[PDB]
Every structure is written in C-alpha cells, then in structure tokens.
Symmetry: D2
Subunit: 254 residues, 4 copies
C-alpha cells in the first residue's frame, strides 16, 4: 500500500510504454504520481492516458533530460506543486538509428555520446535534483536491458549506454546510500514498445525468449511495474545498487 | 496480500533465525504457514514463537534434509494436512566448524560433501517434492550469502556450498520454469543468528558493513522477510533464476 | 619458455583429452611432464601418446581422486621421483549419465555428491598435497565450463559441480596466495572428447557456437593448452582467482 | 610467445611509470616492432628518452589525441604507410577532470561525464575501426580497465562509469570484429603508481588494502600488466575474445 506516497515517473510515450506499466501498478496501489515528458505530443497523449488512472489531478512537467535547466527547474516546480517525493522511476533512453543499424565499430562519436548523454548521464542529474525532494530518503529506479551486461547482436551503442547506466546505478547507490536514497535497476526483457521498433532484430529476439527463457514466455509492462513497486516501496529496504531482471529468467541461461 | 496462500518455511531454530524473519512478514500478510525443523529443540522454539503469530494452528513437521524419506514423507504429509501450497522458503545450511575453522585448502572430503548435501543438494529434493503440491505453479526461495559469489575470508567450505546452491537455483529455475515454478535466492547480509556464531570473523564483517556498505548499517531478518514476500508473491511474476542481495548494497561495492 | 619447469597433468584419457592439448603445448615449450590417470586403459593410451612427445621419461601415476590415500601417496611419490614441481593442470570431472540425462530436479543425492566429489573436491585435496612440492610457489589450473556460470540446458548436475569448482578456485586462491601459489580456471568451449559423449545436445551447442560466438568457430584442445601455458607460467604472475574463457567469446554474448 | 615479425601500436605512454611502458618493455623484449602514440609534446619527449632503453632500431612516434576523429584516422593511415600492416593495439588511455573526480559522484557535470566517456571509452571504438584497416588478416586489441568498472569503488566516481562503458565497448567490439578475426579484450589492472593515479582521491589507502587483503598480499606492477598484454596480443590467446583478465593479485575475486 503506497497511499500518501508520491512518485515521479519519467518516460511515458504512449499506452505501451514500460513506464505506463509502472504507472498503472503504482496507481492501483494508491500512490500519487507525477509525470514528466519530452515533447508536447507525449503530453496530449499523457492527458488522455491519465483518464485511465485514479489520479485526482494531472501533474505533468516537460523535461528533456539533455537540458540541465529543464531537469533543475522541472524538479523545483514539482517540489513547489506537490511537496517532497518518495521516489523516481527513470524510463528514458535514446540512440540514433544511423548508429544502431551500422556495425558497432562504425558508431560515430556524436551518436555514441548522445546515447551516453540521454540514457546514462540523465540519471545522475535526475538523482542530484530529486534528492532535494527526498530529505528523509527514498528510492530511484532505472530501466536497463540485458544488453548492458552482454553483447547482444544489434543492440550496439545502446548496450554500451546501458552498461554505463548500470554502473551509474552502483555509484549513485554508494554516493546516495548515507542519505537513505536507494538506487536500483530493473533489467526488463523485450517488450513491444514505440522505441522497440527502432531496434533491428526485435521480433527474432521475442521468439527466442519464448523458446528459451525458463518461463518459456515474454514479459510485459505490468510485470515491470510490479517489480518497480517492490523497488520503490519499503518492501525493498536494504536492497540498493541492485539490478533485478524481469525477463522470464533469460539472464540466467546461456 | 497473501490471504489464501500457503507457504512452507524450512529452518527456524529460534527467534533470531532468518526464516522467522520471513515467517513474521508472511504471517502479517495473511499467509497460512507450515514449518519444518530438524532438532526437537527447534520444534519447542517453533511452538513458542507461534504464539507471536496470527497462525490459528501449528502445522509443524520434522524434516531433516539429509534424508530423502523425510523430505518425501514430510511434504506428502503436508499435502494431506493443508492441501496445495504456493511456495517454499528454504533457510537451511550446515558445515563442521572443524572445516570452517581451518584453512580452506585443509577441508576434509566428508566435511565438504556434508556442506553440499545439506546446504545445496537439499534444495533440489525439496523442490522435486514440493512441486507435487504446486500443480498450478508457485515460488521457491533459498537463502545465500555473498561468499558464494566471491571468496570471503573465513567462510571457507560454506562459500563453495553457497556457490553450488546459487547454481542449483539457476538449474531449478530453468528446469521448473515450464511448470510455472519460479526459483530465486535472497543473498542476505550478515545477521546475528545461532549459525553465525560458528563463522570466524563474523563481528568484524558486521562492522565492515556499517563502515563501507552504501547504506552504512546492517540489515535484519525482517528485511529478508520483505524481499521473501516479494519473491514468493505475484509481485515478482517475471523474475526467476535471480539472486536479490539484501545487504545494504555491500555486493555492489569493492 | 618452460625448460627446467615440471608440471603434473591430471586427466588424460586419450588423444582427444583436453589435458593432452595442454601436454603438447607444455611439452613443446620445454617442460617436464608428470601424468596422473585413473583407468588402466588411460595409462596405456598415455604410454602410446608419450611417443609423440619430447618427454624422454614417462612419469605416470595412478590417482583416483575419490581416494585421499591415492592423491596423498601419489603426490608424495611424485615429489620423491621428480623433486619439486612448478604447477598442476586439473582436467578431471564425472557425473552419472543417469543423473545427466534426467531433469535436473530429479537428480539423485548420490549422483549430486559423486559429481561434487570428483569434479570439485578433487581440486581442494590435490592443491593441499601439491602445495607440499611447491615451497617457492607455483600455479594450479582447473578446467571448467560456462555451465558453471549459467544454466545451460542438459548440463544439469555438472553445472552445479562446475559452479562449486569455480568457487573452489577462488577460495584456494585466497588461502594459497600468501604461499605464492596461484589458482585459476580455464572455461573451455565445447570440444569433442570422450566425456562430451555423455552430455545431451552437445552437437547442437557446437553448431550454435559457430553460428553465434564472436569468432564464429569452435575451439580446440591446443587453444586450451596455450592458455594453460600462460597461466602455468610467469607470464601470468599477477593473476589468481581468475576464470579465462577459451570459447571464441561465447561467454560474452546473449 | 616470441614476437618477431610482429608490430603493435601502443597508445598512452607519458613516462617511465606508465602502464603502457610496462607493455612496451615486455613486447620489445619479445622481439616486437613497436609504434607509439601520444598526446602532449611533453610525452613525446619522454618517449624519445625511454626509447634508448628499448631495442627498437627506429623511433616510430605519432601524435594522436583521441578526441579528434582526424588525428585518429590520419594517425593510423600514416602508421600503415610507415610500417605496414599491424598485429594489434594496446589502448592505455583515459581522462576525467579532477573537478568531477574529487566531488560527489551525484554532482558530476554533464560535460565532465561526457569527456570521460569520450576519451576513456569511445576512443576504443574509433581506434578499432581505424586500426582494423591495417589488420586485413586478423589481430588483437587490448584496452586497460580498472575494477571500479565492475563495482562502485569509493572516489573513482565518474571514471567507474567510464570504465563500465569501456568494458562493454570491449564486448560489443569483440562480437562485431570477431568474424574478421580481430580479438578484443581488456586487462583489469590493480592500482599502480602512475601520473594519472595522482588524480584519484584515496589512491594510497587502496594500495595498502590490496597488500593486506588481496590473495597474493602484494601490489602488481606495470611489467605484470605487460606480460598479460603479451599473452593477449599473441597467438597464445587464440580462442580468447571479449574477456577481461584481472591482473590485480586476485583482489577481484574476494570480498
Ligand atoms: N521495450 C523494451 O523491450 C525494453 C527492454 C529493456 C529496457 N528498456 C528500456 O526501458 C525504457 C523505456 O523505453 P520503452 O521501451 O518503454 O519505450 P518508450 O515508450 O518509447 O519510452 C522511451 C521514452 O524515453 C523518452 N525520452 C527519450 N529521450 C528523452 C529525453 N532526451 N528527455 C526526456 N525523455 C526522453 C521518450 O519520450 P518522448 O516520446 O517525449 O520523446 C519516451 O517516453 C528505456 O530506458 C529502454 O531502454 C526497454
Ligand atoms: N546469519 C547470516 O548472516 C546469514 C547470511 C547469509 C545467509 N545465511 C543463510 O541463512 C540460512 C539460515 O541461517 P540462519 O543464520 O538463520 O541461522 P539459524 O537460525 O541457525 O538456522 C539454520 C537452520 O538450518 C537448519 N538445518 C541445519 N541442518 C539441517 C538439516 N540437516 N535438516 C533440516 N534443517 C537443518 C537448522 O535446524 P536445526 O537447528 O533444527 O538443526 C536451523 O533451523 C542458512 O542457509 C544460512 O546460510 C545466513
Ligand atoms: N570437452 C569439453 O567440451 C569440455 C568443456 C569444458 C570443460 N571440460 C572439462 O575438461 C576436463 C577434462 O574432460 P575432457 O572434456 O577432456 O574429457 P576426457 O578426455 O574424457 O577427460 C576426463 C578425464 O577425467 C578423468 N577422471 C574421471 N574421474 C576420475 C577420478 N575419479 N579420478 C581421477 N580421474 C578421473 C578421466 O580419467 P579416466 O578415463 O582414467 O577415468 C579422464 O581422463 C573436465 O573437467 C571437463 O569437465 C570439457
Ligand atoms: N595506474 C593505475 O592504478 C591504473 C589502474 C587500472 C587502470 N588504469 C588505466 O591504465 C591506463 C593508462 O593510465 P596509467 O595509469 O598508465 O596513467 P598515465 O601514465 O598517466 O597514462 C595515461 C595516458 O593517457 C593519455 N591520454 C589521456 N587523454 C588522451 C587523449 N585525449 N588522447 C590521447 N591520449 C590521451 C596520456 O597522454 P598525455 O599525457 O600525452 O596527454 C597518457 O599517456 C588508463 O586507461 C587508466 O585508466 C590505470
Ligand atoms: C538486438 C535486439 C535486442 C532487443 C531490444 C530490447 C529493447 C528494446 C527497446 C529498448 O529501448 C530503446 C531502444 C532504442 C532507443 N532509441 O534508439 O532511441 C530508445 C529506447 C531497449 O533498451 C531494449
Ligand atoms: C566470514 C564471513 C562472515 C559473514 C558470514 C555470514 C553468515 C552467517 C551465518 C550463515 O549461516 C550458516 C553458517 C554456518 C553454518 N554451519 O556451520 O553449520 C550454518 C549456517 C551464513 O551462511 C553466512
Ligand atoms: C549442454 C552443454 C553442452 C556442452 C558441454 C561441454 C562439456 C563437455 C564435456 C564435459 O566434460 C565432462 C566430463 C565428465 C562428464 N561425465 O562424466 O558425465 C561430463 C562432462 C564438460 O564438463 C562440458
Ligand atoms: C579509489 C580508487 C583507487 C584505485 C584507482 C586505480 C587507478 C589509477 C589511475 C587510473 O587512471 C586514470 C585515472 C584518472 C585519470 N584522470 O583523472 O584523468 C586518468 C587515468 C585508473 O583508471 C585507475
Ligand atoms: N576470530 C574470532 C572473531 C569473533 C567473531 O566471530 O566475530 C572468532 O573466531 O570467534
Ligand atoms: N542426441 C544424441 C547425440 C547428440 C546430438 O545429436 O546432439 C545424444 O543426446 O547423445
Ligand atoms: N586522498 C589522497 C590520495 C591518496 C591517499 O592519501 O589516500 C589525495 O588527496 O590525493
């Protein structure tokens, strides 16, 4: 029961977004939710999607995590509009198509730094800013993929960005631990989302989970959200710097 | 919420046992519990601690995991008395102090195989027998320690037993995943229990956790129980073959 | 260059044995080699395979690693016959087919402990006995497989023995380090040997390596010997508790 | 491991204490022809001096700042024209502002974080792309990392995230260049007293700890990194790619 808890959810694009998974779960559990989006199309979208939840009001803030100004000012406003928060769910990443579709060794500096910037550094600046609204502690969760731990064909620059995010989680966990802010990752399995269309080989990878993961099935947004509810609540007190694979056990087999 | 769920908890000895941590949490959550024990003295303790729980009746079985017949017959008896179950919490290990207190290179054969038998093989046979009571699926959690992942001074033959256990979780997760039985481990940080008393250097490790781990404090049995509630419930439905560290982040640092 | 170095090599059964690839590389680099075997038939294969070696003397010793007396007496006689040694190559494992070709959850107790005993404990006792012949330090290498790190379908009870063995290596490395004795693992890719004939689905794994491993080909016994050469020698002086994958990179992908 | 007729580019020597100069002494001793890249003229001057300790009949020295595509591209092309086809690269390059390093990790600047990624990780990707052109037949790329890439090590801060990137960069390059028979691997070196080591808060207290706690109860040195580099760069390690060999007295294996 997360009543009288407040969470910030970053990265809803549409009904299929992983973070809308996390949203439905936290909403059921009685949390108050604040949302951040990048472009005005995701906002309109968000307003329509919000009619599906028991949120008594719409708390929506624009934050492109490439802008410090936007992250700093975004969290300040949230603080003034909503008070201290209990946690942040980070569901944000980006890479060029031009770089995803080339050979990994053909990645451009610009593309490689862009993916680092949006997919890994954004968590550091978000963690620094969100800390200001968690004076009594809290919990921050980011969404990673198995390709940050292994080379997964086609995942290329994003995998190096996830490897980076996954260490970001460990260093934020160590840094923010004494302030009672826990930082953790969920490694989701493959899920059909807007961003997933930009990864070459996605369907083939869907099929191989079905055939090979211990549970012989794929996962969904809602199973990610249920694990997110654990990481964001007191149920996981004691757990920090952790990466929980929500992926039908595929991480455990070779 | 675990009303209408039944779990088996193996390996309460007294009030400081990790498994009694788990018991309190599950009981608070509405679960029906069944308890298994090896020594008479542990049943006496169980009978006393039950008075602190909401369990309307004692379901206690003697199962010494060195004996197939006891595991088979115990689980069969459980099925007759409470019907189908939804999972098992395994909190059992053992090694001769004469091995634990030696140089690892001096471990006796009989002592090494004794630690494997009780600390690891026991999970396999518990799972095979418990599966018959989970025709619809369920969840099995075993308790491990960091020493199965890295060589920790003084943990000696038990580290090799926990490495074995941790792989046993993985092979079971794979084997039983198609049956919808999830198998996971909790890697508990150090906690004062009766068994901790046989580990050379224990108190030293307690203090190195407070100083060095991200959260700057040790964990307790109830915090293991909250992560057990998570692994044992539908909250963790896409998670199998996993090892969740309940250790103040100590696992993520070096 | 290994002139005036003496290594013991355990586990040659025939010309296809991984340990015979080790033998060829070390024999070629100038090393003196001492060979241990179990079956009378491995001694005969050894007597015949010594002909294509530069070994001017056959030093063959019956050691079944199930017997403490055998390992203890055999190393004492080795020390008496060839003096102090520089290193041990461990290439020994065993499990019942009956346990191998079953679901892992059906593994017998006696099958589980047989595999732990020969495939892991053998290393702990060999290390202890061979430390006596390494007053100035040396190097000890064992052979593992990726299935000790992840649940590889059909590998079953041997995966759990290999996870055990890999912990054994780390715990020996920590214990024996102050004596300047280094202890490491080679994780070999799949290789057609006599023992590979007991693992189900070995041919389909061969195929999958070629299709998927970074190098798109399988490896061989010599390639293991070449890494054994490195680890047994001073080239690897700051390296212990390590697991080197000789597997075309397959460990590094998913 | 005899390396005549072999040629290795060695990036990142700044003085006699550099890890890369460990690598040099070893390969030079095993008969390798060696080519050396550097950023600051100061390091080139240092290279000219250290070359007198080596067996190298001629000095092959190239200025490559890995922040510039041009200098990496023209560097390697220029290399290929001077000495021909190469057998491998030892990448011994990293950087991050002290400014980001001696502060809280959560206080890391974007510019600083991206700088660390640029010099310490991305540089591997472009070096490999350009060095491939001189390896039509196969070879070996080795990069240098630190345990703080795998675990949050106190004070390593932004460099730890950069090393995680590097270690993944090794894995993705291995997969990609595997079928061209180029192996890509990392050495995870123990702490060593170098110029760069002076950037890291708490460096001396870690040296002490290794010596008290690491299996071998002593620290490692640059020649030890070199002997492993010689293994990774040679045919001794056919079969081995996408791997990270910890040359650190066993410290990685303990907790
Ligand atoms: N789907 C999968 O199979 C899978 C698996 C494992 C991990 N993940 C991870 O899960 C997370 C969510 O992705 P998804 O698959 O759920 O796809 P998604 O719905 O398309 O979400 C990606 C989100 O990132 C936001 N975003 C991108 N750049 C941003 C920026 N600079 N500033 C602010 N927001 C930005 C996008 O917002 P706008 O639309 O407003 O631009 C979008 O909401 C990502 O971290 C992804 O790497 C996904
Ligand atoms: N305390 C810690 O810091 C720590 C950390 C990580 C993991 N763990 C793990 O947690 C689990 C429980 O340990 P604990 O610390 O809670 O200590 P504990 O209270 O002493 O419990 C150990 C239990 O194991 C049972 N057991 C031993 N051999 C058995 C056998 N042959 N058959 C059936 N049961 C047997 C004991 O039963 P009887 O007394 O009836 O014989 C006892 O109830 C163990 O796996 C341990 O490795 C402990
Ligand atoms: N082939 C592969 O794909 C593969 C992959 C990864 C790791 N490995 C490992 O490589 C090592 C060698 O196996 P292999 O593949 O080379 O097959 P192998 O040629 O059949 O060698 C197996 C050896 O184990 C010895 N052995 C078994 N039980 C013993 C005992 N109780 N006492 C003493 N020696 C005993 C056998 O000796 P006898 O014949 O005299 O009984 C035989 O020499 C093993 O550890 C195996 O797990 C193999
Ligand atoms: N010492 C250790 O304890 C340790 C441990 C683990 C890993 N490492 C790694 O080992 C590698 C070598 O460092 P080291 O300890 O030997 O220190 P070092 O002697 O200071 O060498 C660092 C080298 O990096 C070069 N460099 C930095 N930025 C560059 C750029 N933009 N373009 C081209 N070259 C650049 C420097 O060249 P200039 O001086 O000419 O600019 C210098 O030669 C680094 O990757 C470091 O992260 C070191
Ligand atoms: C080789 C196939 C691997 C399957 C991929 C699993 C997965 C799917 C979508 C993922 O989310 C992404 C992917 C790309 C971008 N983008 O390019 O901007 C943003 C977010 C993901 O991380 C992870
Ligand atoms: C030197 C390591 C210090 C931390 C160890 C933490 C720990 C404490 C108790 C633990 O539980 C044990 C230990 C020993 C035995 N026994 O000898 O029978 C049974 C169960 C444990 O796994 C792990
Ligand atoms: C399903 C995985 C297929 C690849 C297996 C690679 C491999 C091959 C042989 C292997 O070596 C042995 C040695 C003995 C026994 N046995 O006695 O049953 C079994 C295996 C191995 O460990 C590992
Ligand atoms: C608390 C950690 C102590 C151990 C660190 C060992 C180590 C030493 C030097 C290291 O090399 C570096 C470090 C920093 C910079 N820089 O600030 O530009 C450049 C290269 C290193 O990676 C790694
Ligand atoms: N070395 C002491 C440490 C005390 C403790 O266990 O914490 C012992 O063996 O008892
Ligand atoms: N299926 C046979 C042969 C191996 C294969 O075809 O994969 C076995 O399990 O022994
Ligand atoms: N913290 C020291 C580094 C080495 C130490 O004294 O532990 C410094 O200010 O650079």
């Amino acid at each position: 029961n997360l009543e009288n808890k407040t969470y910030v959810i970053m990265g809803i694009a549409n009904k299929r977004s992983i973070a809308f998974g996390v949203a439905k779960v936290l909403d059921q559990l009685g949390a108050k939710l604040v949302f951040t989006y990048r472009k005005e199309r995701s906002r309109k979208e968000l307003e329509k999607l919000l009619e599906q939840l028991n949120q008594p009001e719409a708390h929506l803030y624009q934050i492109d995590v490439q802008s410090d100004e936007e992250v700093i000012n975004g969290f300040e406003q949230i603080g003034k509009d909503v008070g201290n928060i209990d946690g942040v769910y980070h569901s944000i990443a980006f890479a060029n198509m031009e770089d995803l579709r080339g050979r990994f060794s053909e990645t451009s500096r610009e593309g490689f730094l862009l993916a680092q910037d949006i997919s890994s550094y954004s968590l550091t600046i978000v963690a620094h800013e969100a800390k200001k609204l968690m004076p009594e502690g809290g919990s921050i969760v980011a969404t990673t993929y198995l390709g940050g731990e292994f080379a997964v064909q086609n995942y290329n620059v994003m995998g190096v960005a996830k490897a980076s995010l996954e260490a970001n989680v460990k260093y934020l966990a160590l840094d923010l631990g004494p302030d009672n802010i826990r930082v953790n990752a969920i490694s989701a399995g493959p899920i059909r989302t807007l961003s997933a269309k930009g990864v070459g080989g996605f369907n083939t990878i869907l099929k191989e989970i079905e055939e090979r993961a211990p549970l012989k099935r794929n996962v969904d947004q809602v199973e990610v959200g249920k694990t997110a509810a654990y990481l964001l609540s007191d149920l996981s007190s004691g757990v920090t710097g952790e990466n929980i694979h929500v992926d039908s056990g595929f991480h455990a087999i070779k």
